[PDB]
Amino acid sequence: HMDLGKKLLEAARAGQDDEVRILMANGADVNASDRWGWTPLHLAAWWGHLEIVEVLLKRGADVSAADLHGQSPLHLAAMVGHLEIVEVLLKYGADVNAKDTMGATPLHLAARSGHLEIVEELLKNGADMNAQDKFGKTDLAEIL
Amino acid sequence: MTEYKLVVVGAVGVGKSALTIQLIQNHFVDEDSYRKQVVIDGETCLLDILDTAGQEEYSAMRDQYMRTGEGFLCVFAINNTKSFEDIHHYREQIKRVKDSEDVPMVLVGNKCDLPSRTVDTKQAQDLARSYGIPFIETSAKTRQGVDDAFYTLVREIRKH
């Protein structure tokens, strides 16, 4: 009666590739969520486990999964500054303009967190930007 | 006199109560009040401290602390990875309860004297930079960082 979803979440947090793949081979739900609505993909994105993000995406992780705060894995990677993960999530069809329950897009969060390269990567993928997307303490030709 | 309403948040077992007790205590011991009068930068003021310990799971009461608090000490334990990510959830909830992206907060990495470290200093410094907040490592047992954490939070409230 071991909860495989719980074990998968723990493995994703830890960045344990072996455990993640063994659990998914045993049928562990790739989109299982914790009490806050974080999935293994949310965990891998926030913690910066690129290898795990790729593994989960290959096995049908939902890139659009929204937690209790309305945040998707793209919101998390954009806020904490994981550029390679932002790129992979967008490649797998992440909604670039998804709004959380504060009304924040991933670009809004990246801009406030001072992650300019991420803001530009989001803009390259069709991100909306407006005057309320203020910058914190911090190609260009393609965007312009 | 100026009062500063400070709320200590974080997962069960991160040392919230121990940190608060260490700040409040007026003598070493191997009953007291959480309204403490101090002098900070020349001015007599009151630290009005609320500890969430005992009600971390109690959603309705967590939100009540977040409404009344002027600044938040966001405590994780350096040997508990879950407690570190929980800071994200607390910060997002504070933003929503207070309807603001600019709430005074300090990230506190507690139990910094323990050898069993699972959250790197670099990860915590980087997260604090993304959040736009100070980061302080603390240990009540070795009396490191505790005064700095609370003093720094008061300074964040004053700057707001």
Author numbering:
A (entry chain B): 0 to 137, 149 to 154
B (entry chain A): 1 to 30, 37 to 166
Sentences reproduced from the published study:
Members of the RAS family of oncogenic proteins are frequently mutated in human cancers. KRAS mutants are major drivers of cancers, such as colorectal, lung or pancreatic cancers. We report here the characterisation of two potent DARPins that selectively bind KRAS on a site of the allosteric lobe, encompassing histidine residue 95. The DARPin binding inhibits KRAS nucleotide exchange and KRAS dimerisation, thus impairing mutant KRAS–effector interactions and the downstream signalling pathways.
Biochemical analysis of the DARPins show K13 and K19 interact with KRAS independently of the nucleotide-bound state of the GTPase, and have Kds around 30 and 10 nM, respectively. The X-ray structure data of K13 and K19 in complex with KRASG12V show these DARPins bind to the allosteric lobe of KRAS, at the interface between helix α3/loop 7/helix α4. Analysis of the amino acids engaged in the interaction between the DARPins and KRAS, showed that K13 and K19 make extensive interactions with the histidine 95 and the glutamic acid 107, which are residues only present in KRAS. We conclude that the main driver for KRAS selectivity is the interaction between the H95 of KRAS with the W35 and W37 of the DARPins K13 and K19. The crystal structures show that when DARPins K13 or K19 bind to KRAS, a structural change appears in the KRAS molecule on the effector lobe, especially on the switch 1 and 2 when compared with two unbound KRASG12V-GDP structures. However, the exact conformation of the switch 1 loop in the K13- and K19-bound states differ somewhat. This difference is most likely due to their different crystal-packing environments. After K19 binding to KRAS, a small but significant increase in the dynamic mobility of the switch 2 loop is shown by the increase in de-protection observed by HDX-MS, and some small perturbations of the effector lobe HSQC resonances are observed in a few residues in the switch 2 region. Nevertheless, HT1080 cells (bearing NRASQ61K and KRASWT alleles) expressing K19 present an increased level of pERK and pMEK signals. This result could be assigned to the inhibition of the GAP binding on KRASWT by K19.
